[PDB]
């Protein structure tokens, strides 16, 4: 079963009276092959429930859950955002995913009201279809659980090239990517995902496209939509992306920087290109980075690992004072430790009877977790 199920927009201005059909109030919906009656029924029921709860509680609802589905709903003016999830997914993950979709739409098409008042529906619908295709192609289990980014003397000069760019006139931050692999970045992780997921489909191979940054991200770049320009340059394997300013539409400055190093970057690139006994997962709260050791094939043991983290990840976000938590069932035990900097989860891939014996191996996982993980460079404090 797909974790992401439904996503559509409803406009309450076009449908104000009872006799007004709700079919015209649907701007986009996925999948596009669904029937019209189900679309109308779902939109009407969701809109009515949201309006009634908002009237009763003087505040719009943010979560509607059913026996088999789970809807995340947010209100932006007269437009309503609805997200389709599965039961197994955590609520916070769905809320973050919906926020990510809204941020992508705002950074890619600007304000919703102006975009729908000025632009046509078909082009935005095609863009939405392509972007949904990309997002569905780029989703994994640990990405579902934690919602992280899709991520050494050579790196020093790779970052030095960007450093020489920041000084180059009117530069806030920049990043260098290789086929979705981050080489060096300075942007905040929220906008780094937007730049990375930008499908890279005048001097040759030079494109400039305006974007819209929220004030919080705009302040972070400088340290409620603000117009900026994105410099996209397509190399054989490399891409260079810079957000500079609104009147960018300097010249010949960034042009010289790439052509002073193109023969060195690709040459350096080609040089670079040319039975686990335990499972672990390390998550960084500051940089939103994820690293773990799981096989591409989902074994029955791996499936039980993902379920255990699901409850424990949500428990930490609700109790800031909780530090240590361990669980055990008839087949496995998983250990966890949390600090305001990082989190750690450990399980041994290698049956309890009666009251637990103090010499039980499941209760001794604390000592093994700190020693085993030091091999792969995971430094546990």
């Amino acid at each position: 079963a797909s974790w992401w199920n439904y996503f559509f927009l409803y406009d309450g201005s076009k449908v104000k009276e009872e006799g007004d059909p709700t079919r015209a109030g649907i701007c986009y919906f996925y999948p596009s092959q669904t029937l019209l009656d189900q679309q109308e029924l779902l939109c009407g029921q969701i809109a009515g429930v949201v309006r009634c709860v908002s009237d009763i509680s003087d505040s719009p609802p943010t979560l509607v859950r059913l026996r088999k589905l789970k809807f995340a709903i947010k209100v932006d003016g007269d437009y309503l955002w609805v997200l389709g999830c599965a039961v197994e997914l955590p609520d916070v993950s769905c809320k973050r995913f919906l926020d990510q979709l809204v941020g992508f739409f705002n950074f890619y098409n600007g304000p919703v009201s102006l975009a729908y008042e000025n632009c046509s529906q078909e082009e935005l619908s095609t863009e939405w279809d392509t972007f949904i295709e990309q997002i569905l192609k780029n989703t994994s289990d640990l990405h579902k659980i934690f919602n992280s980014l899709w991520n050494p003397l050579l790196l020093l000069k790779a970052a030095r090239i960007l450093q020489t760019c920041q000084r180059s006139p009117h530069i806030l931050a920049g990043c260098i990517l290789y086929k979705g692999l981050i080489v060096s970045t300075q942007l905040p992780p929220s906008l780094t995902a937007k730049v990375l997921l930008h499908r890279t489909a005048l001097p040759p191979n030079v494109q400039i496209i305006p974007v819209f940054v929220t004030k919080e991200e705009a302040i972070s770049l400088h340290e409620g939509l603000v117009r900026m320009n994105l410099y996209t340059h397509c190399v054989k394997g490399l891409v260079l992306s810079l957000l500079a300013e609104e009147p960018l539409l300097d010249s010949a400055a960034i042009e010289e920087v790439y052509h002073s190093s193109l023969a060195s970057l690709n040459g350096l690139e080609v040089h670079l290109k040319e039975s686990s006994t335990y499972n672990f997962t390390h998550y960084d709260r500051i940089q939103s980075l994820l690293m773990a050791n799981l096989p591409q094939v989902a074994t029955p043991q791996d499936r039980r690992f993902l379920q255990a983290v699901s409850l424990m990840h949500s428990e930490f976000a609700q109790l800031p004072a909780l530090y240590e938590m361990t669980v055990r069932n008839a087949s496995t035990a998983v250990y966890a430790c949390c600090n305001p900097i990082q989190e750690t989860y450990f399980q041994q891939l290698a049956r309890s009877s009666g009251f637990p014996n103090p010499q039980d191996g499941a209760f001794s996982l604390s000592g093994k977790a700190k020693q085993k993980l030091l091999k792969h460079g995971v430094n546990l404090l």
């Binding site: 509607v64 361990t326 008839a330 209760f363």
Partner: protein, 568 residues
């Protein structure tokens, strides 16, 4: 800022319970005055209207709504043809607490009414009598029940963990047993003025703890779930005489009569009787289930022209049904039975599948009507037969003499039943512990009396342990703050040998008041090992963060062994 509402499919209100804040908010909103029930209905009509369409179309219903920061929580549950709505707006209760409260209210409805609750048509009339005074009285009684349940859940550990607590005194318990035997059950039975009522059980209650209990030789053992409801009902009337009340408990839901006679402040006596027409309910229950199987195969199976007549279940049901009809001979039910007999068993013109469905439904309602006419209109609160006033006074006066000298000691011992100091020497670093046996439903825990800080942490461990158990986790160790929590589950046998652990099924709320989950768990394990007895045990402990984890496990294991040796 709390509200519990029960509504039908037509947005009709049957029961409501609101506090001062909710009433004031509704007055402020609608005052810019009609009845509160009308205001609640006209405010919550859209939710009820929209909920039914979802079930009709996509076979799904809403379960919960959430606002930002959890300011307002809405819980919806469909119990047959009725909708249950719980609203919270003060962050004092969670979704699980609201669901548990709804299930407790539904269990209270079951206990108060019986098999009638299964039929959605009769329960609507029962909860909303045409008379205004009776409706107001019933609503006030149910509101008082909800309030006392909420108070007991927040003040007593017995309802916090849903387990039975007993006062341990070997000398007093025996004398209580002989006193009860000689002067309560025998006194009622030997009196010719009992009017056909048979005494079965009688127990003495001090505060929220049980002291003595006895049962007759012709009485069945009470389930631990029912006695918690009995304790709640006793506590409602006399917080820490009223006429008898008709109650229904699982033996079906056979009728029973409740008597409550207070002796002192905090000491109460409870007596239960049984109507001589009790086993008629068992026949009605069998007929109620028998027609359900007939209707089940009428829809799923093929043309009922000949297949059903060869089914032994239909013949067994017919053998049960015709005996009931001949024994009663009621004209209203005999004419319909003859009509259904012709439809079902005519060799010439068998009834159609659509026609037989309506015929079976008509017979279902008539059986419930007989139950209503027999075991609810003859309630003692409506002029029904009951024990005479002077007979009750004799029992109340005579029992006081036997316990006159033990009044002061009982109150002091109740507040100091178990001393933590007695276990501090053997188990250093221990703060609080709860030992619960899931086979007999009995709990062993000290009396908690800095005191508030440890008291609050007790509920946090209980709530977390129940949440993790639902998805197949049998143990949980976690540290929050300066205290270390624990939770252990294991299976043993009658002789005390260790038993192997199996996979707990992954998921009704976990508890004993509003249903049961442990009885079904024991049966599941017994399916694979029928040759060995099964026992269930639980243990909750609290320790300081200074004690290491390895030392904590050994300390916890020794405590369980000592309690096991101390018991039995």
């Amino acid at each position: 800022m709390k509200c519990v509402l029960v509504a039908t499919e037509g947005a009709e209100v049957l029961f409501y319970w609101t506090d001062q804040e909710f009433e004031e908010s509704l007055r402020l909103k609608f005052g810019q005055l009609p009845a509160l029930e009308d205001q609640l209905s006209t405010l919550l009509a859209p939710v009820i209207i929209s909920s039914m369409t979802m079930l009709e179309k996509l076979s799904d219903t809403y379960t919960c709504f959430s606002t930002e920061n959890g300011n307002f929580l809405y819980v919806l549950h469909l119990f047959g043809e009725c909708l249950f709505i719980a609203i919270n707006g003060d962050h004092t209760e969670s979704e699980g607490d609201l669901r548990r409260k709804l299930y407790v209210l539904k269990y209270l409805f079951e206990v108060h009414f019986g098999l009638v609750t299964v039929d959605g048509h009769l329960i609507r009339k029962e909860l909303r009598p045409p008379d205004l005074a009776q409706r107001v009285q019933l609503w006030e009684h149910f509101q008082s029940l909800l309030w006392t349940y909420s108070r007991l859940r927040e003040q007593e550990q017995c309802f916090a963990v849903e387990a039975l607590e007993r006062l341990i005194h070997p000398q007093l318990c025996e004398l209580c047993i002989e006193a009860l035997e000689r002067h309560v059950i025998q006194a009622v039975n030997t009196s010719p003025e009992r009017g056909g009522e048979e005494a079965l059980h009688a127990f003495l209650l001090v505060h929220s703890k049980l002291l003595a209990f006895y049962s007759s030789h012709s009485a069945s053992s009470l389930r631990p779930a029912d006695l918690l409801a009995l304790i709640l009902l006793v506590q409602d009337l006399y917080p820490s005489p009223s006429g008898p009340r008709r109650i229904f408990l699982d033996a079906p839901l056979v009728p029973h009569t409740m008597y409550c006679l207070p002796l002192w402040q905090g000491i109460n006596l409870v007596l239960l009787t049984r109507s001589p027409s009790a086993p008629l309910a068992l026949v009605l229950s069998q007929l109620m289930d028998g027609f359900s199987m007939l209707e089940k195969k009428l829809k799923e199976g093929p043309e009922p022209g000949a297949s059903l007549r060869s089914q032994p279940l239909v013949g067994d049901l017919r053998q049960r049904m015709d005996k009931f009809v001949k024994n009663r001979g009621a004209q209203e039910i005999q004419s319909t039975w003859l009509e259904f007999k012709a439809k079902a068993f005519s060799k010439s013109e068998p009834g159609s599948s659509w026609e037989l469905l309506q015929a079976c439904g008509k017979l279902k309602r008539q059986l419930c009507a007989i139950y209503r006419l027999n075991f609810l209109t003859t309630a003692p609160s409506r002029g029904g037969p009951h024990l005479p006033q002077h007979l009750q006074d004799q029992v109340q006066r005579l029992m006081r003499e036997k316990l006159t000298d033990w009044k002061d000691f009982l109150l002091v011992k109740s507040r100091r039943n178990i001393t933590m100091v007695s276990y501090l020497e053997d188990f250093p670093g221990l703060v609080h512990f709860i030992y619960v046996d899931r086979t007999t439903g009995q709990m062993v825990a000290p009396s908690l009396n800095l005191a508030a800080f440890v008291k609050t942490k007790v509920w946090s461990l209980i709530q977390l342990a129940r949440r993790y158990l639902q998805k197949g986790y049998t143990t949980l160790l976690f540290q929050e703050g300066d205290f270390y929590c624990s939770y252990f589950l294991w299976f043993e046998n009658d002789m005390g040998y260790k038993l192997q652990m199996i996979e707990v099924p992954v998921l009704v709320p976990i508890g004993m008041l509003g249903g049961d989950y442990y009885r079904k768990l024991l049966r599941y394990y017994s399916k694979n090992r029928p040759t060995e007895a099964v026992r269930c045990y639980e243990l909750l402990a609290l320790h300081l963060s200074v004690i290491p984890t390895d030392l904590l496990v050994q300390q916890a294991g020794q405590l369980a062994r000592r309690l096991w040796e101390a018991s039995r």
